[PDB]
mmCIF file of C-alpha atoms and ligand atoms in Angstrom:
data_model
loop_
_atom_site.group_PDB
_atom_site.id
_atom_site.type_symbol
_atom_site.label_atom_id
_atom_site.label_comp_id
_atom_site.label_asym_id
_atom_site.label_seq_id
_atom_site.Cartn_x
_atom_site.Cartn_y
_atom_site.Cartn_z
ATOM 1 C CA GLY S 1 79.367 101.436 110.971
ATOM 2 C CA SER S 2 78.670 100.913 107.275
ATOM 3 C CA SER S 3 76.732 103.792 105.718
ATOM 4 C CA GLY S 4 79.297 106.437 104.821
ATOM 5 C CA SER S 5 82.143 106.639 102.318
ATOM 6 C CA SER S 6 82.701 104.233 99.426
ATOM 7 C CA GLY S 7 86.315 104.682 98.372
ATOM 8 C CA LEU S 8 87.783 107.879 96.941
ATOM 9 C CA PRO S 9 90.893 107.780 94.713
ATOM 10 C CA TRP S 10 92.586 110.224 97.085
ATOM 11 C CA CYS S 11 93.369 110.186 100.807
ATOM 12 C CA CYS S 12 90.239 109.169 102.715
ATOM 13 C CA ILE S 13 91.151 112.020 105.060
ATOM 14 C CA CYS S 14 92.038 115.089 102.996
ATOM 15 C CA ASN S 15 91.204 113.563 99.612
ATOM 16 C CA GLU S 16 94.146 115.339 97.980
ATOM 17 C CA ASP S 17 96.498 112.524 96.976
ATOM 18 C CA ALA S 18 96.561 108.981 98.358
ATOM 19 C CA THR S 19 99.973 107.302 98.338
ATOM 20 C CA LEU S 20 99.111 104.357 100.587
ATOM 21 C CA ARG S 21 96.389 101.729 100.965
ATOM 22 C CA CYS S 22 95.542 100.331 104.401
ATOM 23 C CA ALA S 23 94.369 96.716 104.254
ATOM 24 C CA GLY S 24 93.106 96.706 107.829
ATOM 25 C CA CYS S 25 90.918 99.715 107.070
ATOM 26 C CA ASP S 26 89.217 97.980 104.143
ATOM 27 C CA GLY S 27 91.838 99.092 101.639
ATOM 28 C CA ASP S 28 91.378 102.701 102.724
ATOM 29 C CA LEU S 29 93.684 104.911 100.656
ATOM 30 C CA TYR S 30 95.677 107.283 102.862
ATOM 31 C CA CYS S 31 98.434 109.862 102.401
ATOM 32 C CA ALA S 32 101.937 110.250 103.830
ATOM 33 C CA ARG S 33 100.634 112.736 106.399
ATOM 34 C CA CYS S 34 97.222 111.811 107.805
ATOM 35 C CA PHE S 35 98.564 108.251 107.872
ATOM 36 C CA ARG S 36 101.835 108.851 109.718
ATOM 37 C CA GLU S 37 99.696 111.082 111.936
ATOM 38 C CA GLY S 38 97.427 108.408 113.377
ATOM 39 C CA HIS S 39 98.597 105.222 111.675
ATOM 40 C CA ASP S 40 101.863 105.514 113.603
ATOM 41 C CA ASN S 41 100.691 104.637 117.114
ATOM 42 C CA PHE S 42 97.659 102.356 116.839
ATOM 43 C CA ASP S 43 98.014 98.605 116.316
ATOM 44 C CA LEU S 44 99.258 99.331 112.796
ATOM 45 C CA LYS S 45 101.415 96.257 113.409
ATOM 46 C CA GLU S 46 98.650 94.546 111.436
ATOM 47 C CA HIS S 47 97.423 97.387 109.222
ATOM 48 C CA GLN S 48 99.593 96.339 106.278
ATOM 49 C CA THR S 49 99.652 99.245 103.823
ATOM 50 C CA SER S 50 100.723 99.221 100.174
ATOM 51 C CA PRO S 51 102.122 101.712 97.629
ATOM 52 C CA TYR S 52 98.839 102.669 95.964
ATOM 53 C CA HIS S 53 99.018 104.666 92.732
ATOM 54 C CA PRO S 54 95.826 106.455 91.607
ATOM 55 C CA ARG S 55 95.135 107.969 88.188
ATOM 56 C CA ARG S 56 97.690 110.698 88.886
ATOM 57 C CA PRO S 57 94.800 112.924 90.047
ATOM 58 C CA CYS S 58 96.838 115.246 92.264
ATOM 59 C CA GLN S 59 100.389 114.158 91.448
ATOM 60 C CA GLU S 60 103.426 116.446 91.320
ATOM 61 C CA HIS S 61 106.386 117.038 89.004
ATOM 62 C CA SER S 62 109.287 117.936 91.296
ATOM 63 C CA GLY S 63 112.032 116.407 93.416
ATOM 64 C CA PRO S 64 112.402 116.259 97.216
ATOM 65 C CA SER S 65 111.397 119.332 99.219
ATOM 66 C CA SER S 66 111.814 120.414 102.842
ATOM 67 C CA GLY S 67 110.021 123.112 104.813
HETATM 68 ZN ZN1 LIG P 101 95.394 112.920 104.002
HETATM 69 ZN ZN1 LIG P 102 94.130 101.475 108.958
#
């Protein structure tokens, strides 16, 4: 498949805030959720991701949170 998405600055899944960039998926920017959701079982062994940093589109100003 080719005709589809081009490359949003946010997660290619939710499009809220991408914090990772999959090289195996054509540099597809993913988040810490959608990614660890599916990109945690497949042959990710090759899908080398990187700490992508967009134009602070949907960034946050707080420390660590749980819950
Ligand atoms: Zn996402
Ligand atoms: Zn991938």
